[PDB]
Structure formats: C-alpha cells, structure tokens
Amino acid sequence: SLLSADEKITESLRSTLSDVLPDQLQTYIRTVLQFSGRPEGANLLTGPNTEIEFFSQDPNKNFPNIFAKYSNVLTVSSDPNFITSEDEEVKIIWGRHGSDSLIGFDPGADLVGKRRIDIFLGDFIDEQFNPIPGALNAGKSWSDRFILGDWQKPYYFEDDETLGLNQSAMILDFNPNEDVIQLHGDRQDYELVNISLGTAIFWREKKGYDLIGVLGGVSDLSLKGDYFEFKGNTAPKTVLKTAEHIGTAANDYIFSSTVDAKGNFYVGGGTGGSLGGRNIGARDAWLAKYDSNGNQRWSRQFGSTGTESLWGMASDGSNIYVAGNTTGQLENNTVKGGNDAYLAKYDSDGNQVWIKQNGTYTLEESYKITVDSSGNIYTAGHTFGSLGGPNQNLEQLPSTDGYVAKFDSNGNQLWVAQFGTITLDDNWGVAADNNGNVFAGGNTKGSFGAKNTGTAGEYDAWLVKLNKDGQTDWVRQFGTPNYDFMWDIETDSLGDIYATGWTLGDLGGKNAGSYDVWLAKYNTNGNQLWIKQFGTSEDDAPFLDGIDIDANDNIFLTGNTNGNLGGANAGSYDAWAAKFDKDGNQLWLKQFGTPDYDTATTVTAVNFGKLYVSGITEGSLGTTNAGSYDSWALKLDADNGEIQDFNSGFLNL
Template sequence: MKTKLTLLFSVLLLLVVAMPVFASVQDRCLNFEEGDYVTCSGIPSSTSLTIEGWIKHSDLSAEIQNYVNIPNFFAGIRKNGNQVDFYVKQFTGSMTASVFHVYGGTLSAGEWTHVAGTYAGSMLKLYVNGILVNQAATPAGELVPNTGSFLISNSVESMHGKIDDVRLWNTARSQAQIADNRFNELTGTETGLVSYWKFNEGSGTVANDVKGTSHGTLVNMTDANWVVSGPEGEWLWAKQGGGTSEDYVRDIAKDSNGNTYVVGNFYGTATFGSFTVSSFTASAPAGQEYSNNIYVAKLDADGNYLWATEAGGYLFESGYCIATDTDSNVYITGIFNGQADFGSISLTSSGSSDIFIAKLGTNGNWMWAKQAGGTGADIGTSIAISTMNIVYVTGAYTGTATFGTQSLTSSGGDDIFIARINNNGSWGWARSAGGTGTDRGYGIAVYGDNSICVTGSFAGTATFGTTQLISNGSNDVFIVKLNSNGSWDSHLLQQCGGSGSDISYGIDCDSSGNFYVTGTFNGTATFGAFTLTSNGNEDIFVIKLGFAGNCLWAKQAGGTSNDNGYGIASGRDGSCYITGPFTGSATFGAKQLSSLGSSDIYIARLDSNGNWLWAIKAGSSSADFGYGITSDTDGYAYATGTFKETVSFGSSSLTSGGQSDVFIAKIDQDHPFLAIKGLSVAFGIGYLGDTTTHNLWLKNGGYDESLRVESFAFGQPGSPFDVVGHIPCEIAPGDSVSFQIRFTPVVSGAVSDILNIYNNSGNLPILEISLSGTGESVEPLQPPLNVCITMNGNDAQISWDAVSEPIVPDYYLVFFNGSADINADFYYHGATTGLQYTHYLVGLHSAHIFYRIIAYKSGGRNAPDLAELRQGMSEAEVLRILR
C-alpha cells in the first residue's frame, strides 16, 4: 500500500551554551590509577538509559580509560584517544548484536569535565559539559540484557584520575535535564534514577548508592583513594631575599595585622626588597674570616618588604625560629658564637656556642636580647608566645647551662631544655629532659591555657620529669606537655618510632587543644595505635593528638628516597599544612609529586580527619627546601625555604642571586569563592522579541566560610541580557544557588556583554561571565513536501522532498508514537541528512500510528505539527486531520 501524505513539520529549538566546569561537584571523590575500580551489582536491564558523571584526568597517556562500564549489558562511557566515547551493544532487526559508538569533545588533563551519554531505542547522544557534541542513529532494536556488574573505571584500561557523582537512569535524559542538573545534588527520588553514587564517604571500601540497591565495592583501593574534589593549593605570590652567597631561612611567622616575618642566616650582603643587610659590620681579628649572621625581615600582606635587620658578629650566628605576640612584637631564638650585637645590645657566649632569645618591635628595633648556655655547644631551636605574651623556648644544651639564675646539667651528650622568659626579658623557669644519648627539642607550641607542648627526638634512655622512656632504635620521637608553671603533665607524654631513626621537627596546636606534629621516620614506626612503614629511606609523618595526649591519627607521605617534614601549621578548620623537601617521586595520599632536582619543595594539606587534601611543589634542577609554614585566620598559608637557580611558584618566577636564596610564598586554598572559572554563555540564535533562558548555578567552593553574592551588573547599558534570582544571598560552604540568565534580542546581529557578580567587600567583581548571542528575524523553515510513507510488512519507509526555504536545515528528525492517543509521548527514532528514513519492526500494536517529522536547524524556532498514518487511510482523511 502506498499513501501520499503532505506533512507539516517541527523545528526543535536547542540552546547551545559553552558552559565551563565547576571546580568541584562534591566535597569528595575517588581517585583511580591503573587497576583501580568499583564494582556494583544489581543493575537492571533497560530499553533506554542515561549514564553521566564528572571526570578529571591526571594524565591522558593511556589511549583507553574507562569511566563507567556495564560489561554484559555492554554500554559505557570512556576516554578513547583524546575524545569521549559513548557506546552500546544492541540487538538489531536481524537479532544480531552490534556495538554502536558516538564520539566527541576534547579532553584536557587536570580539568573537571561532565560527561553524559543517552540511548533511546535508535539514537545515541553524547554530551560534554552539558552540550550535545555528537549523536548517531542506530537501527531500531533493544539493548543486550544485563547479567553482570556495573563498573566504575575498570580492572584494565582504568581511569587515571578522579571520578565523582556518577548517575544511572533508565530514561534518555534531555539536554536541558543534563545541563541544568549536573551541578545539583540529587535527593534520590527523581523519576527514572536507577543508581546514584556521590562518593562522599571519605574512607572505607564501600561506595554507597543513594538509591540503596547497588552499593559499590572498591577493588585494589584504600583510604588514600578518597580525595577532595574541590580546590587545591595555589601559589598566589612568591618573594625572594639574599645575595650572591649561601643564604638560609629557618622559620616564618604572621602577626594579627597580616604581616609576615622570616628569620635565618646569610653571608656577605643580602637584599630583601629595597633593604640590604651585611655580615661584615663587626670588626674581626686579623686573619679571622667572617661567617654567617642573623637576619630578620618583615613583609606586608601583599609580599612587599617593610624592613630587614641583622644581628651577630664575625663568627657564625643563625636565627632558627620566629614568633609574634598580640602586639605584633617579634621574638627569635637561635645560636651565636663569641660576641654578637643585637642593635646596641651585645652578648658574649660562654663556650663554643650559646642560645639567644631576642625581641624586636614592630619597626624592627631591637628591644632586648638574652642569652643562655655554658661552656658546651648550646642552641635554641624553637620559640612560642602565649596569649599572655609569655615566651617559651626549647632546644639542646651540653654540660652545664645557665638560664638566668637557674642552672641545668645534662645527663650525657645533648639534653633537651624548655624555658620560660617573661615579656620584659626576665627569666622564669627552665626544665631539662634527656639521658646519656643525644636528645634535642625541635618544636614548641603553646595552647590557650598557657600549657606548653614540646617535641623532638631522643636516643637510648631519656627521663621526662619522673617518666623514663627507652628508644626502640637510634632515635625516637617524643611529645611532652608542661603546665605554665613548668610542671610536667604526665597525661601527655608520647613516644613514637621504631627501630630506625625517627625525628620530629615541627609542632602546632589549634583552638580546640589538639596538637599536630610532623617529622621523618625510617622503616616501621608506631604512633599511638597507628603503625606506618616507610616506602624507602626516610618518609614524612604527620600525627594529630587530642588535648588528653591520645593519638587521633597518623599519616605518612613520601617515596623511595629521603623525604622530610620540617614545618607544620594548624588551619582554622582543624586542618593542617606541612612543608619540607622531597626527592624523586613522593606520594601524598592520592597525589604524586616528582622533583626536578635532588630535592624540591612541597606544601601539603590534610583535613581534620587526616585525609590528604592536596599537595603542590616548586623546585629547580638543584636542591630546594621548604623549612617553615604558617597560616592566618583568612584561610591562607605562608611558606618559606631556600632555592637555587630558577624556580616557578605558580606565576611567580624567582632566580637566585648566586648560590641559595630565600623564598617567601603565599598559598591560597580554602577561602570561599564561586566555583566557576572562565565562564561564558553562548545563546546562539535568538529571534527578535523571543526570550531564551539559561540556568546559572553558582557554588561556594570554600570549606568553612559563607560567601555573599551582593549584586549583578552588566557592562553595557540597554543590554539584551538580564538576570532573574534572589539578590543578595548567602551561599554556605559547598552549597549552590540558581539564577536565570535571559536573552531577548531587539536588533539583528551578534551582541555580547559581561555579567559582573559582586560581593559586599569591594568594588571589584568576584566573577565575570561573558555572554553572547545573535539576534535574527528569520522566518520558520518551510515544511517538507511530498512526504511518502510506504508500508513493507511491519516496516515503514518514509521519504520527502528537501527543504530549502528560507534556509537549508541541518538534518531531519523522525519521531514515532504507536499509541492510540495523539497526545501521548513521541519517541525519538533517528536523524538523517538524507531524504528518507526506514522504521524497522514498527508493528501495528493499535489502530493508529503517528509520526512527527522535524526539519532541524541549530538555533531555529519551533513550528510543530502532527501527521497520522492509519492502515487503509485515504489522503482525504489525512488532510482532514491536518486541518
């Protein structure tokens, strides 16, 4: 039977936007390496489906990397070459199973990308970042039934990088549904949602399905694979200081006004911004060579040097630690030999080297300087200031050493001292700990109740108050607490380590009374109830102790070479930051860093539960070291160390003046920000007087502080764009809000504008969004003419004449409805650039069959209509329906 029908047409309006990716969709995600995957059971078969999720490649070297794979169902989405590949295995009309693919998009390493694939009977569609990038027609048929597991990544050809927020649907989601909801956290009750893995667990070997039916099991993965999907550390600026000789920095501190201070030693002349210091100021005896002197330098919040000053004599002197009080005065401790001048104050050592403690005013003027020690080698290594502006210092001494009027005598070699100095420089008390081996205090921190926590290393048998410890190897770590009057707190005395050499170098505390300690260990070492084993030689350890002294967690980082934790600082949200040097390849949780030279600088952050959040590096082909780190109440970190040659700290490139120079760097990591970068929205063609819309989701990508969106403003008066939404608004950490951007062209031609988003902190926008569109007055396409439908058994062959007025369509789409209800849903069956389409295995399930043919033009306007095909139906009957 051959029936000639004249069918009117529809044009689909598809809004195509160039939408960038959020830096984070969820707070946590899974990081995959080769062989890592998640297996989920109980996934039902479906005739339609959508697979979607977020991916972030760490590298693109492997040709194939699977994101989601349903092996027996044979559907999935993956990296293939440098594109995304969505595929299904389908029974066709001959009942032969064939695999069909659709490819598109361009992948980049290190960027979050949303990928989605949909299938609906005879059409595959691929979306990247909410944009339809390709589609392909398949013969009508059914998917191969699923009899196995649903895999995220795969046991072979695994994902290299992060996967987050994976969703499986039993419907083919529309572009609008995919684009508008990819940033949203679902409730789990959405229609058609089969499974939903958020990956927010943070630890363990189970990835929960929000629907509760297909929980995933992590294979070849540990807690280290759970990582934060949000922002990583970023170098904001870096400054240098030094001269042509070896210059060193040992520590860094902040004051309440946002200023930064560093201390160390230098030789000859060294320049810090516009300030120059010299180690040749003292008169040396004839034939005596000059050595290194102490320097202290101050920088403002933007990294500009405010002053630099020196102290010392002609022998070796160095500052090892620096701290500030509530009035922004500065305190340093270290070592000096012979006579050393601190401004107009002169100190003379009693033996080979003595300890100094000195105070400077906010302008760099020396206020007082005190010494301690005896005839042996004595050193001050760490200093801390209480909220009452009381000074506490630790280090090592040998023989008999005097601290004001109090004398301490070591039990053997180096012993640990802990001393109190009042704010005016008068000595309070001094305590000793140790034994016959080499024992040193390396770090000291003060809690709000003025209790003191000290850490370092000891060898052999060492006594702390009335408690005796015996090291397991050459050196073990100690952590001990004293009350403000100098009495030993027996509740906090921790010994950590193993049979190797284990040393702690840094300690800090938070506002809740928890203490954070870092250092280095070798072999297998025990930290409370936790056991760590180094990957090679020396590895980094980080531990957290509660107020009562219990070890809450212990973490390690490093590789097969020597890696050290030298500096540690607590963050405002219970996190902590560490710095030091690493060599070769070192792993920090799921993050791997590789050094360029013999050692590079690292900065790393852990959350309050000990999960690695991020790690960044800087370095040259020579030896570069991180020594000190601190943080401020605004959520920034500041680090210092030494470098040689040329080193890039983000966009800041520093070149040493000769040998080693000093760097001071600011790192941005957790302040609230809108988690969209480089955003642009392209509306495409908009017809004059019509309004097209786009949903804009803004997310607070910070960790612990709300962000206020104060206002929107366009760059041009009379803009054809506007915004609908509730302004001002507060966005809590991790939350999102939605606004609607509208485009209503009033003139023909291309238009563009900038949408500026402001908060209440200043005149500069916190985000700029580029908007573009094209106004057009084109009439709708003419309908396809001379449409013929030929029934051949249960198949229908549809043909038509080409449309050319007023413009040529991109292609034609065919929709089918086998229901007796004209208003029932139409099912998308395929697209063709030709002028005919065969609908296989149509069948006559009811008395009516409806088709809709659409001439498609990107940016066109809808003109829908419907044609009905009924067996035995005459042309006159059809025309009556169309009228």
C-alpha cells in the first residue's frame, strides 16, 4: 500500500545514507546540495558536521580517498559510466558536463538482500560550484540518460512484500525538459507518487509495489512524458553478426587491445561477471587472446575482492603487459592506500607472470601503458599524492599531478617522474619513441606548458617529452578558451608525437557543433606541426584508447558520435573509426553500431594486416545482449574500413 509512502521513503533513505556515508562526505555533500538549486537530499544526511581532511596522510581519513570510495565522478565528455562497480552500498554517480549515459546498478550482480542507493547527478558541472562570471559554460546543461532499468529487468527491484525501499536510485538534478529516465517494461508497469522529496517511481508488481527511484525536486510528472524511455521486455535484435561478441549477464567492457608479433589479437577490460574466470568480487580485470583467424585461444581474469580494470595493454612482441587501477590488494602485493595503480605481465600462453601494485596513501588512477623496442615498459597516470616527487599542491585544495613510471621486463621500477601544476593535471596518454624517450599527454586546468586562455580553468591539452632517465625535455600545451580534452597519444616511426581528443571550441578549425574530434602532431623538438579538427553538428569524440599508428605511419582514430559522421546514425551514440596519413590527410571515415548506445574504446592496427576496432554496447552487436553492457571486436580492412567476418588456388609450376 502506498499509504504513508512519503514517510517510509524518507526514513529508509535517510537511515541508509546516514549509516553508510562517512560524516566527512556527508558534510561535503550537504554543502554541495545547499549551494545548488536542488537541496532536497541534504536532510537525508544526518551525520554531524565534520572537518573535511583534504590532506590527511591517513588513508582512512584522506578525503580524496573517502570521496572516491563512494563516488563515480565522470569526465567533461559525454560519458558512459565506464567506472561502475558493485563494491559499495551507496554511490554518488556524477556525470558533470556532456550528455552522460548514467548507470550504477549491475543487473547481473548478486545483490539479493543488499542495500543499494545510487545517487545520480546528471550535470552539476564545475562552473556551478566554482562560479566565475562570464565562464563559457556557466548555466549550460546536457541531456543525461538515467538508466533505472532496461529490456531485461527493472533495476533496484527487490520483488518482495515490502515497498522495496532497500534498493533505489535517487536522481537529484533531473530536468524533464532535457534529461531522460530509462525504464524496463512499459508505462502501465509504473505508478508515480508525489512526495515531499519530489517524485517516487514505483514498479507495479500487480500485487504490490517496489520503489525504483526518487526524483528530487520534481513533481507532477506524467509517465506519458517523452522524458521517460521504456525498453520493453525483449533483448534488442542482433546486428553486425560479423563482430566477435563478448558478454555475460553483468556489465562487461573492453577498454584496450593489442597485437603480438605473430598477429594474435588481444582485448581486455573490466567485468562484473565471470568472463575469463570466476568473479572474485565486484569488477575484475580480464583479457583474452585470438589467433589471426578469429579463434579465441584463451581468456583470463584477475584482481581482488575490490574493484579493478585493465585500462591499457601492450606487447613486447610475445608477452602482454597490462595496466590499470585497483581498490583492493592484488596477489603477492601490498596496498599503499586508497586506490592504487598496477602493472601486470602475461605470457603468450595466458600465464600471469607477475603483478606490481604501487601508489601512495591517496588516490592513483592509471589508464595508459606503452612498451619500447628494448622491451621496457612505461605506465602513466595521475596521483593526488607524492609518487615521483612532491605533489605540486601540498598541505598549506588537493588535485592531481601526472606521472610516468618506467619498468624493466621483470617489473623492477627504474624511475618514476611526476609533473604538473598546482591544479588538476590528468594523464591520458603515454608513448615511447625509438631513441629512448617517452611522451606523456593529458588534460590540465592550469598553465603547464603555456598560458591557459580559458577564463575559468577550462581544460587544455598538454604533452611532455621525457628522456631515458625520466627528466623532462619540454612541456607543451595547446587548446581553446573552452574545454579541450585529450584521450590518447602515439608516436610514428620518425619519433613525432600525435594526440587525439575532443574540443568544444575552434582548435584546428571552426567547430561544426557540440563536441568535435581533433588530431594534433608535434615533432620531437616540441614544434606544433598541425592540428586537424572534424565532426558533425552533433557530438563527436574519440574515447579511451583512441589512437594507434602502424608501421607505415598510418594513424587510426576511434570513438563515438551521435551524429551522421561516417554514415547514417543507427540510434543513440554509434562507434566510428578513421584513418589518416602522417601529414594529417584523412583517408577514410566509417561508422557502425546498433540502434542503442555504442562506443568504440580501442583501436589496434596489425602491421600489413587487419585493423581491429573494439568497444562496448547496450545493444545486441554480434549476438543477443546477455545483460546491460556487452563488448565487441570488429575486424576491418585497414585500406577502406570495411567490416570483415571476424572468423576466417595454388599452382605447381
């Protein structure tokens, strides 16, 4: 019975949120909500006001650690929630800028009897809480999609004789004029109820009710509004049966790929399921090997009871080096505090050779890896601590510096370099040349290699060249007064460095609309050679492992678009890929996907062989979707981007 729903919902949410969230974080979040135009959630956090320990060296009090533990804070890009993991009862999922596809509940995880509240902020952008008059993006917002169910099941659904208050979403900034709430089934499956907090969305069990989500600060909605998207009960019809499909009932992601000297193709990423092995807990890292004819040779899965992913992989020709982050303690390792980075080595037969976990007392992220021609390995990432040297911002607001770490083939650390500004510097790229140097790239809110022309700390792209000993040879910075965002970098055979990303401004040319793609080239002496910019009127961007360069110095880019970039858009975002020559001429541009959300995440070219583009989807790409996100790999003709079947006349003279 919906009688006294208002009181029961408030008491249940308040009880769970105030039990789970540390008082430090409750204090911080109350201040955020009060500063914004959506204060409804603040009364649900009843812990005492507590000093926020922004710079504590105790990993249990360090506030970046605490905030990261209970949050998925995404990027300025239009993001899928590429970091979601079932490792806490309560999560704050924060999209920031861009048209974000926000999910927090894994329908394939065993969550029976578990308290689960996901607090969603679709935008709540930096400009709102760092108010600077005239900031280019002040007052801007985007269409965010809040995923509260899909074709398979409603999310947060306990299906018992209670009101189902133990699991629920709580969306705090839903704007019915722009955002979308995605739901399982059809409108007859739901009843909306006006409550003090706003709106309660109940699933009708036809004998009872179950709370799916609360919408703070919005009332008098209609289930007939176009801001609700209903997904039915049947899996999407399959397209692109030429693709290799990888998926479980849980969220499965390919985030990276590589090839070895024999032409075997590797992919890897994170999974909430049992993909390469039995799930250890929450998200695990995984990888898999295919021969050049498309037959899978093996799959492996590793990690901890906490959360980890493979974010990057690279080969020395035979072995497969993999890098990422963990919230736990990996095998034969010790935790440094909070989240750490790791590097691991797999041999060609799938044997895990070693794992090296490292970091500081506070938050590390690591998304990138490269292997040089001598077989040494470099990882890159960012840290709130003092990993390669003192953080630029020590205790007097905490922020990241970039780092690069160099290892030998046995995992011995040869050096670690750390660099940046007093404010945010994130790494999104690492690449060795053939002469002992290594490049790194990423984003900064500051003036690292140049004066930032943004008036409100908007991101610029940066590049650093390090020598064989980890000393900087130069720092470069480029951008517009708006946000410019780098995703990946790579070198060519001459040692020149290329970077790819997106921009909201006019970086290489006039912006066609929304996000556009760019490709920039610098020479080894730090001279900017050119920047190409291209796109549609809609949202176009590379994503994650967005560039690769083959032995002919052809450049390949990949990412997502919700426009008609390479062809007619199939629906939502699609994947795209493109090929360039070393002088920036675009050789071809292709687009592919399903009617549902798709994005490429990685591209690897085989020298004189096939091109592989891989990624993730909410649709049925390759075969029927098994649950939430599945992943895919496409084998392309590198000369024209045409898709080949993934699985594949002699004269005696």
